[PDB]
């Protein structure tokens, strides 16, 4: 019985989407804030610097019209956010999971475990229960519901699925990360300009992977191997990155120190993960980086001395989807595999053998996952 | 069968808020402090409910001073999530820390040896979570591998065992601190004649935290295993969400629990027992020691009657219900501790009342059922 493998990846987004170039006009128009000219220009500059071209969003103009409190900055809004998310998040997860199961090509009743991960709404029973119902799985699927984790949680889910797959003979784990900015969408406010950053960053999406050890020959086709997974955090990280669930929905606290602190700390995580494997040249790896913002992508690239194309897949996902929180890295996994096929390369990791997936989030938590590629 | 083998419970500790209220005097307290003494018939109905809970006292994070300073907590529906969060986001990690200190004290190994932390609660959420805060409070290092289990519910004690088993068995040398910390402050609210069923919740739930140390391959002469986690399986009764559900709203945590719940649970526990214990060749439920989640006294009685258990099998369960009320996911861990302590008091030879195999059964939202087969250890 050997290492946990990624056996399939699927993704899904809400049909509704908005291009970033026209997003300042849409945002200030639909929140009835067009009289705030200077704030609107600042938001234009922020959106132009995000390096995001479009984002998919569960919230439509129609939903904003039916619920004007969503367009305020602080009015009570958690109840409508919950009414939307408790229903929509399992459905988006279901779409991603169906695509993953189709690639996997095994019967869905063979799934033994489900791990569902989100920070967009909570409920009891959780989204895992709803997804079991929506997918037509049996009640004997072993569920784990990971609520309110954040951006770093893609790495966390890989870390968890590794143990689930390697310690249970024959286990097949459906892992789903589903996120929506509807939990934190709110109108602009000159008293709280930094929140504009969040309103420019976050998009909606779900990713699903199938994880398992001991692949069936001629039936399953491994995509990646989860070699190792480790978490840490930068002390006092909660003073720099934190999000609270309030009557106004999810709040956002992110100091300017965050990108340089993360970039400052990633090399020790890389060393701790890769020295036991005898790897020290970070450009000998393929890369998956959580694109918390374009600044962090650039600063990790510069601090580590990575060739500019290493983070191409990361940038692609940012460009096409924005920050989808824990789902991002999984999207990027798919992209780096798809890109590898388009370039005619021989492995799922851009022709390289070893790679690293690095994610980060609230508390300056950092997840480091070492991956091994597979034949394309 | 191996020593690099199954996950073991190596220590159990518990903690409760200092403030407590007797159940006999709780109707008077509840209707006085929520300014509802004009609701005489509702108060009498609440008296009957509290009399049937079989609870003697509950420990509470909410004091009279906190309730008076925040009248929205004493209403039924006014916006209250923010004050509940301000209380819980701070208090739940502290209570978890107290339980963890007790568990580490029994464990008697240096806390820096803990490699994993699993934190479990349904009382408030935050990012970063209560696990992060507990790392800070306990003085552990940032390299402890954390898993934060928010908004799980009553059954999650079983879930945590199910999780720790894998963490311990797939990571050589790993030592996992598991913490379940719960407070009824997330769902406390004033009474309402339009919503009489909520009175049930107001009579049931108490506050408390439990902590265990879980690990494989115990160190000889240093660690003293308490229980062995033989197996762990989850299921649910189809359409269970229609019978038991709780939603987090601007008014805090709501409560939906039909009268069908105890009979449906009792009806379904035997198939879980059979599925878990037939591979071990066990079919006599009275040959086991028992840990049952006391979601209510009715469920305890109906499981006893449906399975034909000797009346003393659920004594530890009833003891914890009596002395603490329903502490949600923490309950079963409390009961684990109690069944071990009781075994010492009665002079029995194993931590499971002198028996070899036992079962821990918990249940919660969605009619989810967790079934954990346990093996005792020499006392
Ligand atoms: C998700 C997560 O974990 C939780 C979850 O959702 O589940 C995450 O990953 S969140 C982590 C995201 N972090 C960031 O995006 C870091 C934010 N960026 C910064 O702090 C930096 O200061 C930048 C380098 C991005 C700012 O410079 P940039 O190169 O982008 O553009 P410049 O011209 O400065 O900036 C344009 C305007 O942006 C304003 N601004 C940037 N960042 C902030 C923050 N953090 N707070 C408030 N304002 C910010 C700049 O002031 C600048 O203003 P201007 O009006 O032109 O003077
Ligand atoms: C009826 C009986 C109580 C067995 O009988 P009893 O001996 O216990 O008392 P009783 O004779 O019913 O008298 C009590 C008075 O209350 C009324 N009444 C009772 N029950 C309900 C109810 N359900 N709805 C509405 N009205 C109810 C009843 O009509 C009567 O009114 P009156 O007759 O005075 O008019 C039992 O079937 C039952 O439903 N028990 C509920 C206990 C229970 O299941 N708790 C689950 C907790 S879930 C958990 O653990 C946590 C999590 O999962 C998640 C998390 O928190 O994280």
Numbering used by the authors:
A (entry chain B): 16 to 391
B (entry chain A): 13 to 391
Sentences from the paper on this structure:
Very recently, tropinone biosynthesis has been investigated, and it has been shown that the key intermediate 4-(1-methyl-2-pyrrolidinyl)-3-oxobutanoic acid (2)18 results from an atypical type III polyketide synthase (PKS) AbPYKS catalyzed condensation between 1 and malonyl-CoA, whereas tropinone is formed by a P450 enzyme AbCYP82M3-mediated oxidation and cyclization of racemic 2. Herein, we report the characterization of three PYKSs, AaPYKS, DsPYKS, and AbPYKS, from three respective plants, Anisodus acutangulus, Datura stramonium, and Atropa belladonna as well as the condensation mechanism based on the crystal structures of AaPYKS.
The expected intermediate 4-carboxy-3-oxobutanoyl-CoA could be readily fitted into the density. In the structure of AaPYKS-6, the carboxyl moiety makes the same interactions as in structure of AaPYKS-COB, and the sulfur of C166 is close to the C1 and C3 atoms of 6. The structure suggests we trapped another intermediate 6 and the C166 is ready to attack the thiol ester carbonyl to recapture the COB moiety. To our knowledge, this is the first type III PKS structure trapped with elongated and CoA-tethered β-keto intermediate. The crystal structures clearly suggest that the PYKSs take the solo malonyl-CoA as both starter and extender unit. First, the AaPYKS runs one-round malonyl-CoA condensation using conserved Cys166-His305-Asn338 catalytic triad to afford 6 in the active site, then the thiol group of Cys166 attacks the thiol ester carbonyl of 6 to recapture the COB moiety.
